[PDB]
Structure formats: C-alpha cells, structure tokens
Write a protein that binds this ligand. Structure first.
Ligand code: NA
Ligand SMILES: [Zn+2]
Ligand SMILES: [Zn+2]
Lengths: 531, 13
C-alpha cells in the first residue's frame, strides 16, 4: 500500500474535514459553541486560522453559502473552482470579452457577412441563468469590434427576480443603449416561460421563435415599450409570462445570414431556443414562418456536448488536484468517510470525477440506517475515527484525510438539541484522532467544508437547516509553523492543499494557484510567543 | 438560496 517516496515526506499530515462546522461568535442556536467541545476548544486556540468557505472565496456567487460539493472541490483542488457566474463576472470586470476568441469569431463573421448580430437572453440581475451586466459588456465589446448592427432579444425573468422588476431592467437597457453606448437596438421582449422552456413544450418556444424571426406579437417602440409592460402587469401578466413585444419592425428580426449570440450561461433553459435557431429543432415549432437560412449561433457556455456552437466560456479543467499530485510524487494516501459524505472525500475531493489514483487507499464506513439522523446524532463518527487511528498506528500513508458528517446532516434536521450532540460526538472523535497523531508523528490539521451547525435557530426561533456564510477553522498541531494570511485576500479553502504540501515538504504543482498560509518559524520563537 | 438546486451552486444536501 506504500509508495516509493514515502520516506521523503518532511511531515506526515492528518487532515480532518468536519462537515458543516463554522465559526460564529453568536451563541444563539450555536450548537458548536454550546456543545461541550474541549478538544476543538484547544485546537482552535493559539496558532490557528479562520478561512473563508462561501461566496466568491470558493468560486460561488457573492454572498452565497458554502456547500459540501464546492467545499471538498476547493479543498482538494488547491485553487478556486469558479462557477460560471463568478468566472463571467470577472471577465466583465477585467474587460476580457473584447479579446474573447469565440466573440471575436462571431463579430468577424458579421463583419465579413451582412453585418447583423443578435444578442438573446434573460435580462435581469438574478445571476442564476444570466446577468444583465454580461449583456451590457457584450454590447460594449461588440461596438468596439465594429459590428455594423446589433439587436437585443430581451427575455423577461420574474423568477430569479421580483415579478415586476422587468420594467426597471428594461428602463436600464434602453438608457444604456441610447446614452451609454449609443449603439444597439432592442428588438424583442418576451417572457422566459416562452423563450426558456426546458420541458420540450415546443409550443412555448414557438412564441419566442416567431417573435424573433417574424415579429409575431405586439408592436411597440422605445418610447412606449415600458408602458406596454406596465399594461401587461396590470392584467396580471408578469415578467415570466410576457407575451412578445416587437420593436424595430422587420429590421430587428432574425433574418437570413444573421449571427446570434445567446448570453445565458446556464444550459438547461437554453438548449431548446438555441437548437431551434442553430440546429433543426425549429421543426418542432411547426411555425407558418420559414426558418432563416445560413444562421450561425454562439453560446456563452457549452449547452450540450453534441451542439456545434462555439462557446465564449468552454469548460475548465482541474489538473493536479491534491490526490493526483501526491500519486505523481509517489506518496500514498488514505481517504475515509461515512456513507453520506463518501462521494465528497472521493468524487469531489479528487476534482469532480470517479477516479482513484495510484496509492490512494479508501475506506467507507456505513452510515446508520435510521429514519432521520437526529435519531442518532453521533452517526458513524466513532467508526471513522477507528479507521483513521488504525492508519495512524500503522504509519503507512504520509497523508490521511477523513470527513465527519454529523454537524451537517444533523444540522439539516433543524433539531438544535441533536446538533449539540452531533458536535459533542465529533469533538470526541477528533480527540481520539489527535491523541494518535501526537503518538505516531503526524501533524493534525482540522478544517471544515462550510458552516451549518453554528446557526441552528432562525430569527423567529424556528429551525435553521441551511449552510452558512461563516468562516471555518484551520488548525495545525505542528509548532514549527505559523499561520499567515495571504497578502491580498482572506484565506480560503483553496489554500488548504498548498499548505498541506508545504508542511509535507512536497512541491506545489503550477496548477494549484492557492497559496500556502503557513511560514516556518523556529521552535524557540514559537514557544516564546505563546508565553 | 436562489440557485436551489443546481449542481453545484446549491445541490440537494
Ligand atoms: Na463548544
Ligand atoms: Zn458539507
Ligand atoms: Zn449539507
């Protein structure tokens, strides 16, 4: 089970990832603070750190709580794993559209053809399928690239935003196109119920299709379109269900030889309209209008493997996550979790794929077969520690890691008293592991993938069952290292694996763009600091 | 939150 370079490791490391254990100073409904956790009370003192596990720090949209899949992905990868909204928002901030290869291709086609380009997508700040800022940036870039004509097909939201917020986004859009860029024309408004169907209800898609290719709908212009929407509002027709509104007449329709960019980043609700325009699914619409010839369609992301469309943001890769890299260094490793989080210490920790690397030994501890986990809040934490202690007493693997599920899965039941017991059981397990690590020459690091159990009561005293935005601990028993935050940002989950490799005396692969957040210090200086 | 329950902004858990 060993690997050839095990004897080159400077420090063996045991990494405990507690699931759903965050750092909150508010004791109300705080199952971690109120639980008896004498082990974590000591580990989380002196030289320890509090690192970010939510929102932009882990590649999630700003303000969004962490989660087990993203958390284990970021911990295992040693880099920020960007979700699409964050990656595209950064490209907007950094003016990266104007040099985007697929966008430049689309703009070249229009300039070498009939000069006509279309943008189509959900216009709101919801951030779930699209962002209005993305569309504004595309307009700016397409102007800078000198496309003669740009037409916008505005899909109404009211689902990821309030049902009457479309008027505002419409007002913002009109002012933007007229005053800010003085370029581009709004051509269609239609609700996402029609344009963004994902249930193969092609009679819905046809309403959007015929609006874009044939102006089927209510005619309007820049001066009156907002009042039309207000009229629909008064008739109980909200953004999601806006029947089409047609501007610019025939000039703004999708015509023969035109170019189309769909700017939604999420695939499920673009597969249909994009394939109707760019492939053969216009047939399903059974329209009395002919399909325009020689169209070419581009997407913000890849909507389906088998679609031919170029994408502005193709899928990213994650080479040399920690588990891959340890194997490449010929260092063996051990991953352990109970059933409910076994995928997270394998599939997600290892980069989001079913791959076990060379030298990677795994251990699955069965979760208890109970109706809900508040009935056995300790879950199988004891058996996870048992397996880890076996590995520490053997000393075979220089890197071992486990997950402890109780705080998150009991936290999800909303039962505060059960969560307190889940945290007490986790603390006991961590203490038994800690004793073994100190006996057998392992440095112990404890972290979490995101918070949960520290906030068990909602503001009305009811159950709180969700993940949180609180920081998570990062501990280290090795006295020869001091935690140091990155120079330009808060520490985050992406920094755990670079830190482990630095402690292990192993190289850090170029692909891990996280930073190590420890510095070596002399033992005498460390001891004098504490006193 | 608003991303319920997309993989992996907000998976079922
Ligand atoms: Na406590
Ligand atoms: Zn989790
Ligand atoms: Zn959870």
């Amino acid at each position: 089970m060993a690997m050839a370079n095990n004897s080159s490791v400077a420090n063996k490391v045991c990494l405990i990832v507690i699931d759903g254990w965050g750092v909150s100073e508010d004791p109300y409904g705080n199952a971690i603070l109120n639980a008896q956790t004498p082990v974590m009370d000591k580990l989380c003192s002196g030289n320890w750190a509090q690192i970010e596990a939510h929102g932009l720090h882990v590649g999630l949209p700003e303000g969004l709580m962490g989660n087990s899949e993203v958390g284990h992905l970021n911990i295992g990868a040693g880099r920020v794993i960007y979700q699409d909204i964050v990656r595209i928002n950064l490209a907007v901030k950094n003016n990266k559209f104007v040099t985007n290869e697929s966008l430049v291709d689309a703009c070249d086609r229009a300039k070498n053809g009939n000069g006509r380009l279309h943008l189509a997508g959900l216009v709101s700040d919801g951030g779930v399928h699209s962002h209005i800022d993305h569309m504004f940036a595309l307009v700016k870039a397409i102007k800078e690239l000198g496309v003669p004509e740009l037409y916008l097909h505005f899909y109404g939201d009211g689902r990821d935003t309030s049902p009457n917020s479309g008027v505002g986004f419409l007002e913002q859009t009109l002012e933007f196109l007229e005053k800010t860029t003085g370029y581009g024309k709004l051509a269609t408004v239609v609700g996402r119920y029609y344009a963004m169907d994902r249930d193969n209800r092609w009679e819905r898609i046809n309403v959007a299709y015929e609006a874009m290719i044939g102006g089927v709908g209510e005619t309007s212009d820049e001066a009156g379109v907002v009042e039309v929407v207000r009229k629909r509002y008064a008739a109980d027709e909200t953004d999601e269900f806006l029947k089409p509104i047609i501007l610019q007449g025939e000039k703004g329709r999708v015509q023969n030889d035109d170019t189309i960019i769909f700017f939604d980043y999420r695939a499920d609700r673009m597969r249909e309209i994009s394939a109707a325009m760019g492939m053969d699914r216009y047939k399903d619409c059974n329209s009395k209008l002919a399909h325009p010839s020689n169209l070419q369609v581009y997407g913000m992301t890849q909507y389906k493997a088998e679609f031919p469309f170029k994408s502005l943001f193709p899928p990213a890769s994650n080479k040399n996550v920690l588990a891959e890299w340890l194997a490449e260094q010929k260092v063996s490793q051990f991953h352990c979790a109970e059933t409910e989080k076994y995928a997270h210490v394998t599939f997600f920790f290892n980069g989001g794929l079913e791959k076990q690397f060379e030298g990677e030994e795994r251990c699955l501890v069965p979760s208890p077969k109970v109706a809900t986990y508040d009935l056995q809040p300790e879950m199988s934490a004891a058996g996870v520690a048992d397996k880890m202690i076996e590995q520490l007493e053997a000393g075979t693997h220089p890197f071992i890691m486990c997950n402890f599920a109780p705080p998150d899965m009991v936290g999800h039941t909303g039962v505060y008293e059960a969560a307190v017991k889940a945290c007490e059981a986790t603390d006991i397990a961590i203490g038994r592991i800690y004793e073994a690590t100190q006996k057998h020459g392992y440095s112990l690091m404890v972290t979490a993938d995101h918070g949960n159990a520290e906030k068990m009561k909602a503001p009305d005293g009811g159950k709180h069952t969700a993940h949180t935005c609180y920081r998570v601990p990062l501990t280290l028993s090795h006295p020869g290292f001091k935690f140091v935050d990155p120079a330009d940002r808060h520490p985050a989950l992406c920094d755990v694996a670079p830190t482990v490799l630095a402690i292990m005396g192993l190289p850090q692969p170029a692909e891990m763009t996280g930073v190590s957040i420890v510095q070596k210090i002399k033992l005498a200086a460390a001891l004098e600091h504490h006193h | 939150x608003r991303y319920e329950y997309y993989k992996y902004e907000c998976p079922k858990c």
